[PDB]
PDB file of C-alpha atoms (C1' of nucleotides) and ligand atoms in Angstrom:
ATOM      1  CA  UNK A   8     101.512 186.250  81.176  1.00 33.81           C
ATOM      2  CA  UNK A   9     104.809 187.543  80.367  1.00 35.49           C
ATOM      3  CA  UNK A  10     106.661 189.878  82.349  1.00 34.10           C
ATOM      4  CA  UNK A  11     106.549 192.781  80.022  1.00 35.41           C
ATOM      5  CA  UNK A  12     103.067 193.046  80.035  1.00 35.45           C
ATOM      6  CA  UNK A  13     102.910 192.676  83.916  1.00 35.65           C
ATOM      7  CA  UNK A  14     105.429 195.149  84.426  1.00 36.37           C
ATOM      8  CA  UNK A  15     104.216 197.677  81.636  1.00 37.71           C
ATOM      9  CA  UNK A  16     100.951 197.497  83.124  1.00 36.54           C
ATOM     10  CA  UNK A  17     102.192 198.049  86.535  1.00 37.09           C
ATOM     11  CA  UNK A  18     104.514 201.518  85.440  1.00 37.95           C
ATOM     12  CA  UNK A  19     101.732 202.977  83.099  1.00 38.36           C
ATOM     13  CA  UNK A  20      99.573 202.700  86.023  1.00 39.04           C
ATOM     14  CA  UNK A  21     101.577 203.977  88.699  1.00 34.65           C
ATOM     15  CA  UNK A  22     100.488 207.141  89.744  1.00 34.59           C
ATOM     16  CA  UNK A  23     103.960 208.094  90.503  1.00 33.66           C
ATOM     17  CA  UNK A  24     105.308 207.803  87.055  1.00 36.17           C
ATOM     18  CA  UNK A  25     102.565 209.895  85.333  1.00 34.96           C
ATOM     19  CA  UNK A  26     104.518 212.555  84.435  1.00 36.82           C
ATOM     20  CA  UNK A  27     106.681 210.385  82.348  1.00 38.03           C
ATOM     21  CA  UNK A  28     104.025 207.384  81.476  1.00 37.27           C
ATOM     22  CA  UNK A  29     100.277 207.311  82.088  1.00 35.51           C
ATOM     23  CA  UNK A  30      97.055 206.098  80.920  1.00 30.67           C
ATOM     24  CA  UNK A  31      94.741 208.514  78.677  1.00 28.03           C
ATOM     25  CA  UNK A  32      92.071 209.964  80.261  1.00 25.51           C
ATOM     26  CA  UNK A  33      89.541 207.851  78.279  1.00 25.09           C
ATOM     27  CA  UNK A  34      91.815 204.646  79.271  1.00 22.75           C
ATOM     28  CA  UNK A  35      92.390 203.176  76.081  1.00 22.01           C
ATOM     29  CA  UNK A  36      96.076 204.047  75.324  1.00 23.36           C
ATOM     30  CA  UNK A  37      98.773 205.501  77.326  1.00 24.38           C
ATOM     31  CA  UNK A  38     101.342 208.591  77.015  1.00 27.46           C
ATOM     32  CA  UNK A  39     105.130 208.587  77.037  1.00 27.14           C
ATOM     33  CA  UNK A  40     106.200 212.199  77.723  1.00 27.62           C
ATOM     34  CA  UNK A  41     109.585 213.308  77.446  1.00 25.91           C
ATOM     35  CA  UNK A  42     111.004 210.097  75.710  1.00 28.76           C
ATOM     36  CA  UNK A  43     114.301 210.852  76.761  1.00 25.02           C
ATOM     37  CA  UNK A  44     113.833 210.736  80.531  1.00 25.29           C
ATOM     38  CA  UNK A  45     111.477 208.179  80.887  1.00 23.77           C
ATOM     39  CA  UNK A  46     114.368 205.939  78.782  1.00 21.66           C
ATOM     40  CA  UNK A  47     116.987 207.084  80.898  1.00 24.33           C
ATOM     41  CA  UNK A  48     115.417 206.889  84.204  1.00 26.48           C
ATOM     42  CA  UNK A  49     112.485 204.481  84.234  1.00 28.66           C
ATOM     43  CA  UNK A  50     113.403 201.759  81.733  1.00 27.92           C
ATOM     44  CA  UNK A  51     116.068 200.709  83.659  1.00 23.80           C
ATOM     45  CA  UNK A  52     113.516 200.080  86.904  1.00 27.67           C
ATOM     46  CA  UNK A  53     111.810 197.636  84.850  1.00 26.41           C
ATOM     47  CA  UNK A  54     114.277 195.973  82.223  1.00 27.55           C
ATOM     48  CA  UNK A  55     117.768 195.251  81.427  1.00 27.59           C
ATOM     49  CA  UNK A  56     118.053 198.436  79.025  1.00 31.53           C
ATOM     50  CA  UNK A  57     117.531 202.029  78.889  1.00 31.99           C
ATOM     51  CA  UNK A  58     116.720 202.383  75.194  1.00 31.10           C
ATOM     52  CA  UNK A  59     113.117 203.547  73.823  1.00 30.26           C
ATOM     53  CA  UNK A  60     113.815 201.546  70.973  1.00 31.86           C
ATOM     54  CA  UNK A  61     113.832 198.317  72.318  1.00 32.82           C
ATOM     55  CA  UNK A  62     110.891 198.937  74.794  1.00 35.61           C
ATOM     56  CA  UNK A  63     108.889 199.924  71.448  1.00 33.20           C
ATOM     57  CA  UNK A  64     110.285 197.007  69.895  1.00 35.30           C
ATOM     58  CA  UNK A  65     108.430 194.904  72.608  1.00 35.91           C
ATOM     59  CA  UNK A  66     105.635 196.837  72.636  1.00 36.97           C
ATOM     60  CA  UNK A  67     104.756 196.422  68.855  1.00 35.88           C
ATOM     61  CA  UNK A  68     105.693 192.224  69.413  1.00 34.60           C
ATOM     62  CA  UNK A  69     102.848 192.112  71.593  1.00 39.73           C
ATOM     63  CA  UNK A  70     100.676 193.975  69.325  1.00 42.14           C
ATOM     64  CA  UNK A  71     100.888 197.356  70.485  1.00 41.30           C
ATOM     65  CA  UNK A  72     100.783 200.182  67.376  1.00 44.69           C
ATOM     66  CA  UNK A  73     101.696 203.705  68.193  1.00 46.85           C
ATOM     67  CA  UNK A  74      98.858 206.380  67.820  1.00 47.79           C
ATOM     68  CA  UNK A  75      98.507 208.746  64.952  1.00 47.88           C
ATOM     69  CA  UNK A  86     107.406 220.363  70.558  1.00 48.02           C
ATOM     70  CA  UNK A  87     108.040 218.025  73.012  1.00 50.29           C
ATOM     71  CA  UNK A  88     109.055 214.543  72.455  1.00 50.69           C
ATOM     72  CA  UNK A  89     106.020 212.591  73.601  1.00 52.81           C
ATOM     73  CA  UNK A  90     104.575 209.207  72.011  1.00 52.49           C
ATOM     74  CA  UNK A  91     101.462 207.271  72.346  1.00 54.54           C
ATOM     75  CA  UNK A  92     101.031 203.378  72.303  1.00 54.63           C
ATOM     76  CA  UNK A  93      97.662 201.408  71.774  1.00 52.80           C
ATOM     77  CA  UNK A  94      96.715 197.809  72.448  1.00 52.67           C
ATOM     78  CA  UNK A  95      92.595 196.675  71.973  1.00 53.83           C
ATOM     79  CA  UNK A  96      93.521 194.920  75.144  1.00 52.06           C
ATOM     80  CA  UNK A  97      95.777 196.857  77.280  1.00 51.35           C
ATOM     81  CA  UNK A  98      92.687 198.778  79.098  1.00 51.48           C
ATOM     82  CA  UNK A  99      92.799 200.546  82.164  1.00 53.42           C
ATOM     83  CA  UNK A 100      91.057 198.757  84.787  1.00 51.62           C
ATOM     84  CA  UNK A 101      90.754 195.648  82.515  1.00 51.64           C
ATOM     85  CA  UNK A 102      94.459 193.939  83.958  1.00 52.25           C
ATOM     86  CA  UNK A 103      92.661 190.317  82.887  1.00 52.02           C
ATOM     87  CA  UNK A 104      92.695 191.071  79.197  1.00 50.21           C
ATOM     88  CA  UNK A 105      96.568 190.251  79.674  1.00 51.67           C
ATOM     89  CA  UNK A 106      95.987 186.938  79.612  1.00 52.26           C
ATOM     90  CA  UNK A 107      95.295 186.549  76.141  1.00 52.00           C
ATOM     91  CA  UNK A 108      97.801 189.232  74.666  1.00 52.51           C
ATOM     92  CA  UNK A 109     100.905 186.845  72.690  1.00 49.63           C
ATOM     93  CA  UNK A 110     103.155 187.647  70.284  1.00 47.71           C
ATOM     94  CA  UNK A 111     102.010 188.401  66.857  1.00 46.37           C
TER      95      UNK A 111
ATOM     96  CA  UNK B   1     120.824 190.281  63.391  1.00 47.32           C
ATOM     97  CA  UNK B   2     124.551 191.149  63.255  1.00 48.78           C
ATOM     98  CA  UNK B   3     126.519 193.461  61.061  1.00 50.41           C
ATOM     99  CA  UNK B   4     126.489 192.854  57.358  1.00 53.10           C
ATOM    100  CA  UNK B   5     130.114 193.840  56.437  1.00 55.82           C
ATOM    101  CA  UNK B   6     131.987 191.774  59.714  1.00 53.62           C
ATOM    102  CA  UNK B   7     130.753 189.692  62.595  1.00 51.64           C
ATOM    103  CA  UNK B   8     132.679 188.970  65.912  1.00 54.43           C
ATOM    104  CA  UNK B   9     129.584 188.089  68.553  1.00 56.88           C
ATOM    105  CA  UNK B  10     129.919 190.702  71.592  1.00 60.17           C
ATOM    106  CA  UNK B  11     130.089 187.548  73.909  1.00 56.56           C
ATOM    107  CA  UNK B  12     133.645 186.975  72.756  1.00 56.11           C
ATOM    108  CA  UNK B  13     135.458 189.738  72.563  1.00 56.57           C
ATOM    109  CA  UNK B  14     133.980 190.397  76.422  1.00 56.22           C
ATOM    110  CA  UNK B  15     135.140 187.365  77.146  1.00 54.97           C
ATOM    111  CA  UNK B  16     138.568 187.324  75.640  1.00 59.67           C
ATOM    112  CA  UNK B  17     138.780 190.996  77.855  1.00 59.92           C
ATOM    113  CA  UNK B  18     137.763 189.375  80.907  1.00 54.90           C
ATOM    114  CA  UNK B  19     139.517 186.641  80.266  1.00 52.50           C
ATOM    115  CA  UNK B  20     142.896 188.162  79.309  1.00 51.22           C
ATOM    116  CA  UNK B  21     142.730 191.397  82.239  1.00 53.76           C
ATOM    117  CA  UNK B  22     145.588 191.195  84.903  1.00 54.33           C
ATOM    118  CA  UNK B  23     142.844 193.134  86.781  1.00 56.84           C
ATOM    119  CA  UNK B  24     140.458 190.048  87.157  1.00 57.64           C
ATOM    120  CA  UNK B  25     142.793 186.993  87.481  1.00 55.11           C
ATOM    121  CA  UNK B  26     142.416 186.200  91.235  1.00 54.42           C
ATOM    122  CA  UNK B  27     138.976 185.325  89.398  1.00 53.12           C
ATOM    123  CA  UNK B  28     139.229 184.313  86.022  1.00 52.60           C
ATOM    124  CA  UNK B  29     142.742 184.454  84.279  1.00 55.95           C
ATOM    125  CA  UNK B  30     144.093 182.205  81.049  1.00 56.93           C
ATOM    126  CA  UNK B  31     145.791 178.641  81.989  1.00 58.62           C
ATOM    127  CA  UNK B  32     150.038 178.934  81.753  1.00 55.07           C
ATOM    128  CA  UNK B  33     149.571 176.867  78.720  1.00 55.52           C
ATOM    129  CA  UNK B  34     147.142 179.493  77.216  1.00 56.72           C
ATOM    130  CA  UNK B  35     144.447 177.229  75.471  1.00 55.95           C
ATOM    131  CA  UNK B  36     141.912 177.088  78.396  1.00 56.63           C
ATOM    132  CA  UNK B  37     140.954 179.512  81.278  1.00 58.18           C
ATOM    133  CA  UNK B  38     140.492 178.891  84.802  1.00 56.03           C
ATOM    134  CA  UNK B  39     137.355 180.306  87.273  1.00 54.55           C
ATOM    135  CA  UNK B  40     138.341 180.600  90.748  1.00 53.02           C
ATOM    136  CA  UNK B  41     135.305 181.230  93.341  1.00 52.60           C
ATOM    137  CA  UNK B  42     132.613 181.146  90.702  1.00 50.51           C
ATOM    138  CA  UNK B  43     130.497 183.506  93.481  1.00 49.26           C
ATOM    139  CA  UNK B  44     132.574 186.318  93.463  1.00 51.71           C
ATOM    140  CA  UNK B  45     133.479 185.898  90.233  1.00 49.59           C
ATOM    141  CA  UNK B  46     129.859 186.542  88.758  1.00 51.15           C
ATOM    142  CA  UNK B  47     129.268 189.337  91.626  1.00 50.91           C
ATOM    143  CA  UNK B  48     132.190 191.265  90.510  1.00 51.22           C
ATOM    144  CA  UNK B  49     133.546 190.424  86.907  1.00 55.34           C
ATOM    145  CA  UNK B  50     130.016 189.625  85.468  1.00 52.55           C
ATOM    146  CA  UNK B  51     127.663 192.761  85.826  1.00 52.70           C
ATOM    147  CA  UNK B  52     130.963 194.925  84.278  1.00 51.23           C
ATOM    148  CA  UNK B  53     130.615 193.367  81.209  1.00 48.75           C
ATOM    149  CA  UNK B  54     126.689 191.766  80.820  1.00 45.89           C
ATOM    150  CA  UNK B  55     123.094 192.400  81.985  1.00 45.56           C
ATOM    151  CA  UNK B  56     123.202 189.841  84.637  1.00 44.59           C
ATOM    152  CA  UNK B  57     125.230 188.627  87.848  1.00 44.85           C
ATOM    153  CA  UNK B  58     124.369 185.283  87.172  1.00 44.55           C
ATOM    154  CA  UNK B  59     127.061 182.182  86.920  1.00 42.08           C
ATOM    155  CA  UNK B  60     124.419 179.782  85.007  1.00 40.52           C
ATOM    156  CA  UNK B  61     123.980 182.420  82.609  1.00 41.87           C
ATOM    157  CA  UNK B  62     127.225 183.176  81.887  1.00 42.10           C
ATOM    158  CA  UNK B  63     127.715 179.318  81.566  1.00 45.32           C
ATOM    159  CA  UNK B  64     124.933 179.023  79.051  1.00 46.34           C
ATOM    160  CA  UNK B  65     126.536 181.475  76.753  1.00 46.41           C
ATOM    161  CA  UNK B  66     129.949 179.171  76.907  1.00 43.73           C
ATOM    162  CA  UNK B  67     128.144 176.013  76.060  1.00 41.66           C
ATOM    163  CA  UNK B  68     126.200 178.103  73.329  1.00 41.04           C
ATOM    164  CA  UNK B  69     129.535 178.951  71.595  1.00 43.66           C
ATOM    165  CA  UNK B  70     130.899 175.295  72.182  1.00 41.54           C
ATOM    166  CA  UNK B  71     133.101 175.782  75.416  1.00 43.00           C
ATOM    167  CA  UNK B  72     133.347 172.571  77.336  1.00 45.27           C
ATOM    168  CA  UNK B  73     134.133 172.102  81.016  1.00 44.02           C
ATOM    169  CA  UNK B  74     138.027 170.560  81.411  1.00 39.31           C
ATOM    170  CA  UNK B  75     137.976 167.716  83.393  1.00 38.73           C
ATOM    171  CA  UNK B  76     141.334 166.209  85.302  1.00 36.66           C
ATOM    172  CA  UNK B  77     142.228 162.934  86.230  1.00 37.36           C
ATOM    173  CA  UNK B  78     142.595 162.697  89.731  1.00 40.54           C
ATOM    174  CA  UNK B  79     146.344 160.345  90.748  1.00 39.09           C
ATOM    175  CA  UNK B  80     147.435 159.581  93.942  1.00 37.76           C
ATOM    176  CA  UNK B  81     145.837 157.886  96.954  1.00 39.45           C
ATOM    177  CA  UNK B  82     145.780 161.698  99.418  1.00 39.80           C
ATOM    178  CA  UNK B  83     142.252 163.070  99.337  1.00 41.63           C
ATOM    179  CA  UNK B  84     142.045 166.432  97.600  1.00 38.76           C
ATOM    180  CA  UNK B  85     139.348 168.555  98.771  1.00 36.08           C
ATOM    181  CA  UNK B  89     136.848 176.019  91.057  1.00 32.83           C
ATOM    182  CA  UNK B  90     136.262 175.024  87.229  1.00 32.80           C
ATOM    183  CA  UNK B  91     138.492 175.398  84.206  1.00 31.88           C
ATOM    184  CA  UNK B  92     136.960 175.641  80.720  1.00 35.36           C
ATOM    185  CA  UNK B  93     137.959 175.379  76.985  1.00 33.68           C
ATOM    186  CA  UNK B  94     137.537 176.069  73.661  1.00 32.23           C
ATOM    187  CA  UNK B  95     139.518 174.996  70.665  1.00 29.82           C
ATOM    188  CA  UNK B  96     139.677 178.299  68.983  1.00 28.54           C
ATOM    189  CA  UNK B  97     140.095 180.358  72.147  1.00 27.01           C
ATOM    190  CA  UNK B  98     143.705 180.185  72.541  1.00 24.31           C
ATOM    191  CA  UNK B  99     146.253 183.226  73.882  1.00 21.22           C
ATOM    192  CA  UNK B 100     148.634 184.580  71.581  1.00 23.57           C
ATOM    193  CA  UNK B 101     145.832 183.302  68.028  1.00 21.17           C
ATOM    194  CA  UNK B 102     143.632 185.628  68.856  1.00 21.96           C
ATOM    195  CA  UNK B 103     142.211 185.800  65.633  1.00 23.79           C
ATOM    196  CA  UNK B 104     141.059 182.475  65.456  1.00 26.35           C
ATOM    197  CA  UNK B 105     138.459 184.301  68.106  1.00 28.59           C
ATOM    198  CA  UNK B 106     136.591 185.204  64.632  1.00 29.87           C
ATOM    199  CA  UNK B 107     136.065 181.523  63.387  1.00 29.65           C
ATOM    200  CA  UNK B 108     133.692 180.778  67.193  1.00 27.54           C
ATOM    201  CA  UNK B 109     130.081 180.374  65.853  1.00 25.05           C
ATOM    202  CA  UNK B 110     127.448 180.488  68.199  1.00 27.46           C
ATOM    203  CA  UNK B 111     125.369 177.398  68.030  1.00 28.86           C
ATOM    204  CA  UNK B 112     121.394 177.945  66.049  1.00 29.03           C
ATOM    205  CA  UNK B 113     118.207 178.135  68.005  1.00 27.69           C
TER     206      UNK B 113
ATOM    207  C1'  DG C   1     106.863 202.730  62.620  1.00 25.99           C
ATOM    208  C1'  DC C   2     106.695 197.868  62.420  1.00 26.81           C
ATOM    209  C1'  DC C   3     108.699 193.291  61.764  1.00 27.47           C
ATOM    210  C1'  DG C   4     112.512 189.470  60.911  1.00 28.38           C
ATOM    211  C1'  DA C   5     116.454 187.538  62.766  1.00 28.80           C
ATOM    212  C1'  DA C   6     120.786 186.907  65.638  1.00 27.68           C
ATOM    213  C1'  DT C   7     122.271 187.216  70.116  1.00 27.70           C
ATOM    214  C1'  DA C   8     121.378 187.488  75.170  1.00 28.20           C
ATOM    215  C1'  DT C   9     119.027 186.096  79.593  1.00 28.07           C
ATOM    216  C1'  DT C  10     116.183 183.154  82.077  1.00 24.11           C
ATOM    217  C1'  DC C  11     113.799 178.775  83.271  1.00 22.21           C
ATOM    218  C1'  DG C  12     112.891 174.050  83.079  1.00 21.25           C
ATOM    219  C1'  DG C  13     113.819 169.274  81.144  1.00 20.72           C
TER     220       DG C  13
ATOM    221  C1'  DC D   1     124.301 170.844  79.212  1.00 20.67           C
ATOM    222  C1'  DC D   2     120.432 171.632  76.216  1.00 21.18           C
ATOM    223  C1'  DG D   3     115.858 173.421  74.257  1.00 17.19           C
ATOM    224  C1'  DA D   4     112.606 176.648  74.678  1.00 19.25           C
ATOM    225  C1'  DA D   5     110.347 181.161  76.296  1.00 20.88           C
ATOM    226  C1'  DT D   6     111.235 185.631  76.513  1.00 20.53           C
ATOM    227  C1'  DA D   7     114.241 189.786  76.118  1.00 21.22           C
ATOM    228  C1'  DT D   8     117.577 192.882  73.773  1.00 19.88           C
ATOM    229  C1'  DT D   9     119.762 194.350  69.864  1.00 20.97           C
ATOM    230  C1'  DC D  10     120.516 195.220  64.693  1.00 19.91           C
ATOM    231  C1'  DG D  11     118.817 196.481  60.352  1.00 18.57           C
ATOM    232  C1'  DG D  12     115.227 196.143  56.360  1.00 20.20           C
ATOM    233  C1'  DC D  13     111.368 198.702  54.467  1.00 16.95           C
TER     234       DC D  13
HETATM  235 NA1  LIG E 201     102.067 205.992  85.479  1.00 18.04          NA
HETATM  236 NA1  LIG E 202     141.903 187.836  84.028  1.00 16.92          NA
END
DNA sequence: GCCGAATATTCGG
DNA sequence: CCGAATATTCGGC
């Protein structure tokens, strides 16, 4: 399993992040709020960059597709569930 | 992939920088000839000239980027019968004073 | 917003 | 030193 989907999984689920990245409450997706913070100051604790472009860059070459005021996003994967780390296993490029 | 209109690779022009800084030349610093540089205490070196310029601290990475733009490792004969108790590397088009010839380095395709 | 490609970093042969 | 896996960046719809 690559490390982007080890570490992603790790940050979105840290509870100390949630105010900046977190699960959905029904578990299928997570939130980015505040886009510009979270790329400044957590990107940087998990990759060589601090630039939301290139962490959505990885995010849609493992599959991910964004969901339909403030600068917030949401990403979804059919396998990036909460609870469900094993899924990972079988996540590859596209 | 790079620029449409012009392409110099980032590597290079870092490197000719590092290369060519009074700053850094306990470390890295051209030859007196000026067609090859010199890396003295290859430790220090990537702890302190490295991260300034690249996402890493890493020697073996910085090495992999001179082999992928076809830098080569000078190697000296060795006279005299004293035993001699550091690494040196070139480029053909990496020369002090033709700097443009800097543009014509290709980075190698994989 | 998503994907192709060149360059960058890491790891193993 | 090299090839590949993965990561980061650049630019096209
Ligand atoms: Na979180
Ligand atoms: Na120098």
């Amino acid at each position: 399993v690559p490390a982007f989907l080890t570490k992603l999984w790790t940050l979105v689920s840290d509870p100390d992040t949630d105010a900046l990245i977190c699960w959905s409450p029904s578990g299928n997706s997570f939130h980015v709020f505040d886009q510009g913070q979270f790329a400044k100051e957590v990107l940087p604790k998990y990759f060589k960059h601090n630039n939301m472009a290139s962490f959505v860059r990885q995010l849609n070459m493992y599959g991910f597709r964004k969901v339909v005021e403030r600068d917030d996003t949401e990403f979804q994967h059919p396998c990036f569930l909460r609870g469900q780390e094993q899924l990972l296993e079988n996540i590859k490029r596209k």
